[model samples]
Target: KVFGRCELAAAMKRHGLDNYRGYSLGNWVCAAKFESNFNTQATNRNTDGSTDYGILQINSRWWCNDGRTPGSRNLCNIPCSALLSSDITASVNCAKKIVSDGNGMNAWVAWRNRCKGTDVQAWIRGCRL
Candidate 1:
């Protein structure tokens, strides 16, 4: 499922992405922008044989278990496929777990390189919290 900009923002807010773990809703929206372009089914194969899944692109090697990635920690204790669901609840929950593990929002490279130190306010400019 592909989400429009404000649509994705609203969804994230409803799911409590707003001010989650000290990260603003705009930060999450900006990270999602560069991660999967708000497509729930997006996936990216990593060079280390791991894969990123879903809109936020949670890593299979550490966050979610695909049962295919070697040495997967499955820290979120969820199947990687759950992150691909259009509902986004599983994905959002897993993201919370990732951030709570002392990683903050730096768990996502996209956030580090794209959203961090940037003007993320524009990401949620027209969206109602």
Candidate 2:
């Protein structure tokens, strides 16, 4: 029930971010907590009727637009029931793409700065990948 350190490690591996900065888990978990309270089945409905699902609250409609199926959509397209099915490596890779695509992981940074008093650089201390 509690997405503990083990789950975090697995998630990191599934997302291909095992080498991510030391505080990547803290960042991700902080985001997850803010977004969905770490609930894998969480879903949010947009005004346009599209849905954001899973721990990351990824919008499947937006993510699936490329029509590359799961490849383009990554874990974003995963059904709520099957969310978190991907290994940590795949999850981390998918998240990296999303975060690196100009979004700036602002949410994570905000959470850390406000709640944890930490900066991205501080969080990434051992992060490599």
Candidate 3:
């Protein structure tokens, strides 16, 4: 909950995510909004026996673990709880890997539905960065 568009753009760029994985800052910002509504603590169970973690909503089916859950993919090798932080370093890093692997931002349904082909400038309209 600590990050709005301005803070998120600044923090993500500071972490080297400004177009690092071939996606623009606006792409990342819009996807984050649809995924977690800017709340780092956000988590939700998907209907397909998977769970989404943190602000980016990294899927437990491929990224993180919830311990007692049956997630085996855990590709990012990070605990799902670790992403639910105000710092957001782990989640951002994992997203970099996911995006760079060639899936692009299409890996997220939010991006596919709401951000794709949309004017990205609106995502950071009032942000200084």
Candidate 4:
């Protein structure tokens, strides 16, 4: 499912992305924009043969069990497919874990390149959340 900017923002907030691991709602929203453009079914095949799935693009290598990324920790203990659903409950939970593991939002390259050290407030300015 494709999500609107504010729509994804609200959904993410409901799932506790706001201030989770010290990353703000705007930071998560901005990361989603660059990572997957708010696309719930988005996936990408990386050079390392791992895949990134869903809106926040949780990686198959270390987060989800894709059954394809060899030696994957699957630390989140969820199927990679779970991240592709519009509900995003699993994605949010996995995302929280990703940050809590001391990576903060740095786990996502998009976050580092686009949202980090930037004024993310504009990402959700009119959401009124």
Candidate 5:
């Protein structure tokens, strides 16, 4: 909703993703692609009965509070709805916090499985940033 991959990459760059716990910007782009294909309104319910929140597909089991799920750590101190928006600022801030808390992008299963230690440069191909 907010961007195509290129624009999303530029948004990440503008949001200081390069400064995020030393993660490569391309990995972030790859994870975003695998997670939600850059759709801000994307949401998925995992088999575990936990729902992933937004474009990053952050899980309610560990991240934000959805009020429907109980015992959420809510480290982000925000409603899960905040992450599922056209405006990604809240999601970005919470994700940076998640990274700072030692999860890095590992908080996203897609990041670990799809982006980790992989050649992800194609995620940024043709980006003008």
Candidate 6:
């Protein structure tokens, strides 16, 4: 099933994924597009053979340790993954917490920072999300 823009936007907002209104929606779409092409069930297997699961590409082992198994029904409670399956809003909220704490926005900031060094406004326009 395809997730609509408004639905995803609401999810992001409810979860605290962003706070900048128009900017936040744009950011959410950009992040999602760059991260997983908006696939809520996306998963990745690392070169190290480790696994990353869910929409935000949450690493199962790194986040979940309840012995309930990775990607299990209860895995949603495990940090960011919880937000991925259970509630988009909650997931974004969790992300917001991480960003607020200075750990979440590193990727976004790093991308913008590196790109911005070359062309300030161009980078800003390029990485608005």
What lDDT tens digits, residue by residue, belong to model 2 across residues 1-129? 335444654555555554354335556665666666666656677676666656666665545332322433433443433444433333344566666666456534335455355552333245342
| Residue-level lDDT tens digits of model 3 in 86-129 | 99899999998898777788899999999999998688778777
Model 2 segments more than 4 A misplaced: 18-23, 65-90, 107-129
**Model 4, span 1-129: residue lDDT tens:** 999999999999988889887778999999999999999999999999999999998888899998889988889999999999979999999888888887678888999988889899899998967
Every candidate's CA RMSD: 1.0, 6.4, 1.4, 0.8, 1.5, 6.5
Candidate 1 contains a number of clashing pairs equal to 0
lDDT of 1 by residue, 1-129 (tens): 999889999999899988988898899889989999989999999999999999999998898899889877888899999999989999999888888888798888999999899989999997666
CA deviation > 4 Å runs, candidate 3: none
Instruction: Tell me the lDDT of model 3 at 72.
Output: 58
- Give residue 27's lDDT in candidate 1 (0 to 100): 94
Ten residues in a row with the worst lDDT in model 6?
A: 115-124
Highest TM-score: which candidate? 4
Each model's C-alpha lDDT?
0.91, 0.51, 0.85, 0.91, 0.83, 0.48
Estimate the TM-score of every prediction.
0.95, 0.56, 0.92, 0.96, 0.91, 0.56
TM-score between model 2 and native: 0.56
Off by over 4 Å in 1: none
User: By the lDDT metric, which is better: model 2 or model 3?
Assistant: 3
RMSD of 5: 1.5
Residue 116 Cα positional deviation in candidate 2, in Å, after optimal superposition = 8.6
